[PDB]
Homo-oligomer: A and B are copies of this chain.
Amino acid sequence: RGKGFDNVLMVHDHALMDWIGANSYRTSHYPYAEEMLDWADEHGIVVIDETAAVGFNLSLGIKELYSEEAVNGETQQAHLQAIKELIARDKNHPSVVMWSIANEPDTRPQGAREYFAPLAEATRKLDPTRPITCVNVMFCDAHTDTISDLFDVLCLNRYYGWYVQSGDLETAEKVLEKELLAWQEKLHQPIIITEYGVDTLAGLHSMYTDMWSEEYQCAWLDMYHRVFDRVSAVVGEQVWNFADFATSQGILRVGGNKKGIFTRDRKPKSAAFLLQKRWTGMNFGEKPQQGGKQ
């Protein structure tokens, strides 16, 4: 039963998270049901509410389609009502600490700053108790006409040696920090990476830490780690997918896309074993040592 509710799945996944040391997650690319109230509350799990606001590009084959004559008034107003309906529901829930208003929104073409800011300014008027956010794509340089200013914690989710720099970990780190440094200054606000990951086929090992192997995901993941906790600005790290999950038709994606730390049936990849040493060898809720004595 995809996208459907199960008491078991909730008791179990939550047990996974518990074990593996994650205190948080975004309901991603839509609102969930009632894991909110139950789990996050009771166990103090901090959630970053998102909206089913996703897929505002023609920009990633990785035709034609409409270019901002749609994604217009009737759609902004609908986007309005989406944020209405979503604050209606979780405005009490102690586990809600943000409102992500949209994921991966395109910020360059045409009339972007203009559609968007009024919605920052409406939601604001519906909750000022919890700061609002928005989730960035891979365009960066002093960059968004719309996202930069209006939001309180920039949430940036990328794959810096994945669809470009394929498997070059060392340069991808170079590019990673100098661009966190870049993102650091511009806004002098707190930065949370919301989708960091790789695609890894559950049962694949190899000596050369190849792409799509267990030992790549592991090497790759902790490449991030080092430049992560080495930047004052970074305050949130959230690995992109929990489990493999189904995806639309195409190539790039296989049986879903194998982007989970766990598999669809919750069997754990070797990456679950990193993120449980790292993630519990922290003190509760506090940045690790950004350097250890030498």
Which residue from B4, B6, B205 sits with its C-beta under 8 Å from A269?
B205
Whether a CB of chain B sits under 8 angstroms from the CB of A123 is: no
Tell me the dominant secondary structure on chain A's binding face.
loop
Q: How far is the CB of A133 from chain B (nearest CB, A)?
A: 28
Task: Let me know if B255 and A201 touch, CB within 8 A.
Answer: yes
Task: Let me know if A201 and B163 touch, CB within 8 A.
Answer: no
Task: Let me know if B202 and A203 touch, CB within 8 A.
Answer: yes
Task: Let me know if B251 and A252 touch, CB within 8 A.
Answer: yes
Q: How far is the CB of A199 from chain B (nearest CB, A)?
A: 7
> Which residue of chain B lies nearest to A258 when distances are taken between CB atoms in the complex?
B254
Name the segment of A208-216, A229-237, A278-286 touching the other chain: A208-216
Whether a CB of chain B sits under 8 angstroms from the CB of A204 is: yes
Whether a CB of chain B sits under 8 angstroms from the CB of A292 is: no
> Which residue of chain B lies nearest to A218 when distances are taken between CB atoms in the complex?
B273
Whether a CB of chain B sits under 8 angstroms from the CB of A185 is: no
> Which residue of chain B lies nearest to A266 when distances are taken between CB atoms in the complex?
B207
This chain: copies in complex = 3
Q: How far is the CA of A266 from the CA of B19 in the complex (A)?
A: 27
- 30 A/B residue pairs, CB under 8 Å, sorted by A: A4-B8, A6-B6, A6-B8, A19-B207, A162-B251, A166-B249, A166-B250, A167-B249, A167-B250, A199-B251, A201-B255, A202-B203, A203-B203, A203-B204, A204-B255, A205-B267, A205-B268, A205-B270, A206-B255, A206-B267, A206-B268, A207-B266, A207-B267, A211-B250, A211-B251, A211-B253, A212-B254, A214-B270, A254-B254, A264-B265
Q: Which residues of B contact A162 (CB under 8 A)?
A: 251
Q: Which residues of B contact A1 (CB under 8 A)?
A: 8
Q: How far is the CB of A42 from chain B (nearest CB, A)?
A: 21
Q: How far is the CB of A201 from chain B (nearest CB, A)?
A: 7
Q: How far is the CB of A63 from chain B (nearest CB, A)?
A: 13
Which residue from B167, B202, B207, B249 sits with its C-beta under 8 Å from A205?
B202
Q: How far is the CB of A154 from chain B (nearest CB, A)?
A: 26
Q: Which residues of B contact A214 (CB under 8 A)?
A: 270
Q: How far is the CB of A233 from chain B (nearest CB, A)?
A: 29
Q: Which residues of B contact A265 (CB under 8 A)?
A: 264-265
Q: Which residues of B contact A19 (CB under 8 A)?
A: 207
